[PDB]
Symmetry: D2
Subunit: 432 residues, 4 copies
């Protein structure tokens, strides 16, 4: 029983697979620290003034070496933390073990069941003689749990920092029922650059290579949707020598596709000739059963947008069709006449299963979360209110500024005359 474990200090206030993995886990955390200089720089700069002294943070995020560097940064700034996984598969057990040995109440392991998942959140949140005043959440599951099961604890929370798209939607559904301030770091300016364009551009190629070993040259590709995600996928494939067609419902984005040098088509016009279909819409039923029926043999289908509904994968579970798992995250769906399509990640986000977020990008996110937590926790009366807010612009600039040394970038400082000219402070914020 994994529940019967103690760390070297005699505590058992945690639940991890194997506490003896701690030393291996601490080595992986040390590695992440060396790859995240900007988070280490924020830590060192900010720790002396202990701006999270009295912070009692409950977190639900991915339990990786990089998340540990964030957690221990929060600790260095004076916080007390409890933590659970936001996903049943993503936990690095050795990291969970290292955190438990160092004294973090963490309730997390790889391969949790649904019941384990909620059990861990409750153990994270409901503990004798300690109540949270801050939430850090990736998905809103932990937030909702406190909401439904501990309404009076929920009312006392000073701040919710939320990282996910769906988590942010749920906070917006809260109908006058949101009674504490929330900070939407999903739409922070520096984050968005990375999360949308830069990451998807790389991860479309990485995931396609991982799943198919394909060559990109001369592939006919259709990308549905031309927002930032679509733009990024289009640019990546075009740079690798693919021929890319674009679909859109918004004429303004459509015109941009045209100006960017792509043919703008209805899916039907190209469905029968394409080698690759990629959904980037945030919409449902973009690729229908009939589209799938019209696809040529060996056409590859994937989703880079949301959920698993952009492609109607459910429509492929009819008795007539045969599925074969040929590789991790890769199914051949086969028709009676032998025609085959290649479906990736069962139509879930390709990058989540088949690529890895660079540590640098995890640093951008972690840094943003840390500053949002500091901001909500230390905020004066009246500033924030029963509503969803954005990170102050100066803090967003600070995230960028902390990461600039990675590139040996040299920022120019405005002179006094230029600052007056533009109506700005020398220290920012530079844009409204």
């Amino acid at each position: 029983s994994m529940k019967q474990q103690k760390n070297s200090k005699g505590s058992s206030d945690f639940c991890v697979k194997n506490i003896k993995q701690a030393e291996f886990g601490r080595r992986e955390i040390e590695i992440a620290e060396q790859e995240m200089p900007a988070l280490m720089a924020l830590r060192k700069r900010a720790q002396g003034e202990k701006p999270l002294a009295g912070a009692k943070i409950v977190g639900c995020t991915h339990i990786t070496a990089q998340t540990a560097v964030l957690m221990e940064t929060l600790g260095a700034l004076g916080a007390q933390c409890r933590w659970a996984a936001c996903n049943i598969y993503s936990t690095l057990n050795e990291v969970a073990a290292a955190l438990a040995e160092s004294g973090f109440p963490v309730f997390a392991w790889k391969g949790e069941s649904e019941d384990d998942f909620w059990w861990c959140i409750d153990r994270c949140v409901n503990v004798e003689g300690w109540q949270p005043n801050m939430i850090l959440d990736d998905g809103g599951d932990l937030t909702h749990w406190i909401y439904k099961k501990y309404p009076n604890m929920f009312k006392k929370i000073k701040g919710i920092v939320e990282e996910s798209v769906t988590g942010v939607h749920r906070l917006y559904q809260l109908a006058g029922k949101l009674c504490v301030p929330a900070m939407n770091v999903n739409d922070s300016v520096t984050k968005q650059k990375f999360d949308n364009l830069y990451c998807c551009r790389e991860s479309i190629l990485d995931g396609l290579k991982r799943t198919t070993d394909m060559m990109f040259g001369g592939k006919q590709v259709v990308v549905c949707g031309y927002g930032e995600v679509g733009k990024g996928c289009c640019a990546a494939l075009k740079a690798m020598g693919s021929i890319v067609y674009v679909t859109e419902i918004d004429p303004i984005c459509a015109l941009q596709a045209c100006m960017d040098g792509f043919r703008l088509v209805k899916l039907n016009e190209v469905i029968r000739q394409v080698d690759i279909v990629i959904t980037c819409t945030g919409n449902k039923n973009v690729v229908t059963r009939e589209h799938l029926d019209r696809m040529k043999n060996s056409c590859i289908v994937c989703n880079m947008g949301h959920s698993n509904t952009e492609i109607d994968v459910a429509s492929l579970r009819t008795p007539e069709l045969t599925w074969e798992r040929v590789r991790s995250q890769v199914d051949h769906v086969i028709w009676p006449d032998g025609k085959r399509i290649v479906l990736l990640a069962e139509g879930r986000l390709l990058n989540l299963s088949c690529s890895t977020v660079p540590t640098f990008v995890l640093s951008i996110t972690a840094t943003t979360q840390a500053l949002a937590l500091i901001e909500l926790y230390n905020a004066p009366e009246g500033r924030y209110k029963q509503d969803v807010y954005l990170l102050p612009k100066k803090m967003d600039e600070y995230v960028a500024s902390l990461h600039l040394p990675t590139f040996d970038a040299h920022l120019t400082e405005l002179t006094d005359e230029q600052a007056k000219y533009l109506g700005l402070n020398k220290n920012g914020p530079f844009k409204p």
Copy 2:
């Protein structure tokens, strides 16, 4: 000084030019199918029937297509030039011949300018109820000289940054008692004006002024907003090596992520072949920078005014200026070192490149739709302030231009529309 037909109610150099100008218009019609499509879609239903529009814009074949689009939709119009030199006489003639009270010619004098404006406005038994202006000078004239008529105006559409500024200064004072629609902040218009145009114009302006080859040039672009982004991308695509300066760390981080060294100007000033300012700021390139530049360095401005580069600092008496080609000065130091200054530090594209007709169509169409939007507005909707073009109108501008590219827009199903929380006919995004 007299047309076909009955009318002397116009004024232009020479009305025998009607046939030459009319061919010109007919070509511009072919190069502006979005405006022609707007007539096809809208002229039956006559959305501008009862609009009496006075216009003050550049008198070109492209502008003619717009004016006759306003006609086709119902409007009655009179027009003057917004600039004393820019008129195409032949086009003026041809609009006259078909019966536009047009008051404009090339090489006007200052008084003739206001004379022409006054002839648009005043005017027998015809009181204007709409203004389309590029400059704000027709609007100002009407404001000051005909205050009671001004209060009667249903709508003002102004194209210039400066005209818009003046409209916001009226509103601020409480004196804008008619609605204005700002046509410059629309998503479509900004894209062309800020990125797409600049991408092309920096390259065209540099070729025109210098005959340069781009490959292997060392370039520094000051500022990485939309305009700098565009110039960096264009030059990089032509094989130039581009360095970037910024004061905003978020923009600086983008420049890095896009593949550029992010530097202070002093780090590269002595080695670059080309310096381009895209900042909106003053004294970005100082006298000291100019002194430190190597022989034959090219300096130009893609930002604002003529002050990003401190050109005034180069007018000291020991420096020698030689005009070597239109818009190109060599500024020579006592020791014989030369820099090459383009367009006297003014916007290079304004004097060394040409706006494509397609982009003139985006502008013209936005202006037509704005006029239609104000004129047919319910009494509630617009009153005594500056409004932005509604998003649906910007979507239509874009939609009207898609046939240039053979682009095929997809339509949402009812299920998808409901899923996204949107109307099938848009608007598809906020703002």
Copy 3:
């Protein structure tokens, strides 16, 4: 022993790890067939006429599913084949078994010793009642083995087809020793496009992702050498937002790097600031111990050129440095003060250990090899004498032509007057070799 196995027909004329893997192998081969339509079209078009009837082919290549499709094409055109692996680690055991079960004498398994290697080559080549006519070799080891050990068999070989840079160099010695015609398919025109530029362009990003999970944006990269390989690496990294510096010894290539938008530097000018170093020179000691000492902490170093000597990896085996293997093909080399460098694939070619050749590219090579074998074997006497020849241009065009349907590309035909105007046959060749 491994050596004590029979196929379902009682033959033990092969040596394979495990014959019961045959059925799984056969399914891998069938997958490869579907992904190599151009080789299957060549097969189907050329089969009936049996252009390789009487051909007795000894091959030494990578034993993958794709190679199987080539081998069975050769069989389908009438050849008799025996096969061995050209590398001790690359054999896919299940494919070797599928082959052995279909009746190919194949001598190959993953993880052979050096003695095993030469033993397999000997078994492939030296067998009572069957002399080879033709050699297909990737590296020259099989060719060398026959030359040295069976010099009378060698004199009787109708044709050598060689695939590899080092194999071709070896053939060129010749020296007066090459008494049979060889065809160099390493330098075929269609092949080269894919082997040099198109492969490296993809490989570099894939291999770096595989080994480091890096992002490319804002990485300062120095690429040594600006031939096709370096060119391909530069374009790929540039397109992903890296800042790329190039080194060259050839001023004509240097000038092209400049025109392509890259700063051209000496390595020491950027060695202290770069995040990634890539060697693409075909030269040795391009990155020396002293360069590695100068590198900043966490700099990534890899080779996309030849062998393992472009970076002087041997210089890092000094007792004050420690190595930690941190992932497959990833070592951290750590200095007394704690500075580290990240070395990939021990300075061997990154793409070979950390990427995969797309099957389409394996198709181009296989089709090329097949046609070279056909040409040599059916050649009039004495079109080919005692030298190294290139694949006929028309065959090279045919390789390209067979693969165009993958892209739905529609080739234009010269009219009769255009053919006359240009001085070209309607069916080519369109350009000289």
Copy 4:
């Protein structure tokens, strides 16, 4: 005029008073031709062309002036004529005349003037040439025909033109080439500029000049995917055009595919394209029938050869109406009102509507100077009586001398590396 300052009249130019203005243009050209200036400085007062007596027949531009003065600085004695009756810059010719160069050239020579100028250049009392530099083969022809004894004592001929080189080969096969010639038309550096770098720029520049177009979203078909086609496609693609490619050679067709273009037959796209560009070296690629099928306002131009890639002659018919609307731009109008925009009458667009950068002219002039040095100073037996290619090492030196323009720094092989590669440290580094 008639005499220079020193009272010589051994020249023939329009007006000797133009010297000062010409000198100024030469000075500007010097600043844009550092490679030639560096050859001058490297001499260190030695005279590597001391005994050379060079007759030259080239375009009389400011760039040519710098070459001629470089040959003089190296110790050559030079006489010169124009290779073309229209191209002479009179001010430059005057400046050369003032400096003591016997130049016989002016703008608007008649055909009789042209040959007289050549005769004045090569036939002078008490001075025979021993070297020829020629762009066209006409000076060479004159000497061969009129002064056959002088011809036989020529030490070397350097020839710049395709046609001049063709003529030298005719003489050679006839057994009549009794002196060494060097073909500097074909060097690897020159090839790359003429075929790829210059065309990449000139197509875009030529299209802007003629039509004021925007490139974004244009549908373009490029016929031919050799070096010129490759360059045109990459330039238009980089500006956001959608580009289709035609080819007869499957190897080139496959490259187009792999580079991210659709590979089509012209007929598949002739009705939809906005721009047609011919880059084939072939005849009747764009036929009368293609022209009839083009959509209204389609722009048509040639980047290949001659004026026959497009069948322009088929449009010179009473049925069709031609209208010159701008320099090098015709609207060709059909009875039904459909219009085509023909550029440069289907001649080479770049030659009428663009400028060769001075850098490219420097590559050419530097090549010529080095070929002259090499031929003049070669030891007995190196160059027999035949056509030779520019040696590789000298092509490398040309390139190398131009690298400082880019602040580019060349690496040098160690002894151990040179040995490993089987190369001399100083080159040549590649075969040919």
